[PDB]
């Protein structure tokens, strides 16, 4: 039998796309059953026939890497997306040298580097020519998540944001050359400090990263890893950033949203990868108290003193007197009112619906205006929920108003 190449034959390329760690094992070009990772559907591959002649050209001069292929591209191309078991088949292929590139991939996928394939090929000199080439390209799934720890933290109380992100994987020629966290903070927020930067289970020191100054940087936070920092990062490590903030005021809406970004190099293609987190929400509103004379019609009262408590009901006071923005006692003004700017809603915390919505606020009247008796009970429980603060009474959307009555002493 002849061992020659049959140039009246047509070849094929079969890609078995995998989600996982790179193959530092040079592939046979034949079937391998290397299901180390999970099959990845949705990745598109583009093959490009190169000018090189297998029939009459010098094979010693043929490209062996994606870099050597540059400048030898032809108009003959084909695009296929992975479908069943993360498989893309390129059929009725003219014999020749092809460049294989990833054109599209799903969200969070860090693609592998482009590669070169010969149709036909041999793994070993003793093998028969192989016209049906099989390759196992690799990819890495990198997820980015944002959480908020803001339970019982009112206006000017420090609360934290935490950004979690999967670092990419890198081969032994390849490396992680850049890695940063970006977060555009709402104008109502004041950055406090970065509390923790973690690479896997390794808590980094302040020499391993840099912090910009959000106040003079349009309220945008940037936390970049230095050269020292990067050295501590291992392939595919779970990166973490916890930083502290204070909400200055309630503002125009009860809700305050946060979303962040992670930017790193693709170790294989060296091109920048931006990854965006989910959006998290913190809710605060204002509490307005109006002191009224119970028996004397349409009359407000100056000089009524109050304290604020956490409570399950008016008969059962919890934490308090509470300090909200350096004040732990409020007195009604010349208009018979005061406004606490502001408090954490009782029905939504740490980024989710409160379970159970048992928390309430309690106003304790500590002193009645001159010539007025101290009401009994002197405690008013408040259902400070998003829905109740949202109600309007033109007689607003971010303020909940509480009417409290006092009666003149003696009679
Ligand atoms: Ca309201």
Numbering used by the authors: 42 to 436, 440 to 455
Wording from the paper:
SpaD, the subject of this report, is the major pilin protein that forms the polymeric backbone, or shaft, of one of the three types of pilus expressed by the human pathogen C. diphtheriae. Two crystal structures, of the full-length three-domain protein at 2.5 Å resolution and of a two-domain (D2-D3) construct at 1.87 Å resolution, show that each of the three Ig-like domains contains a single Lys–Asn isopeptide-bond cross-link, assumed to give mechanical stability as in other such pili.
After testing several different constructs of SpaD, we were able to obtain diffraction-quality crystals from a construct containing residues 27–455, comprising most of the mature full-length SpaD but lacking the C-terminal sortase motif residues. Improved crystals of the full-length native SpaD were then obtained by cryocooling the crystals under high pressure, which enabled data processing to 2.5 Å resolution. Aside from this, the two copies of SpaD in the asymmetric unit are very similar, with r.m.s.d.s of 0.28 Å between the two D1 domains over 126 Cα atoms and of 0.51 Å between the two D2/D3 domain pairs over 264 Cα atoms. Interpretation of the electron density showed the clear presence of three isopeptide bonds in the structure of SpaD, cross-linking the first and last β-strands of the CnaB-type domains D1 and D3 and the first and second-last strands of the CnaA-type D2 domain. The isopeptide bonds link Lys58 and Asn180 in the D1 domain, Lys187 and Asn299 in the D2 domain and Lys332 and Asn450 in the D3 domain with the essential catalytic acids provided by Glu143, Asp224 and Glu406, respectively. The protein crystals used in the structure determination were from freshly purified SpaD and the three isopeptide bonds seen in the structure must have fully formed during the time taken for crystallization (one to three weeks at 18°C). In our SpaD crystal structure the pilin molecules are stacked end-to-end, bringing the C-terminus of one molecule close to a groove in the N-terminal domain of the next.
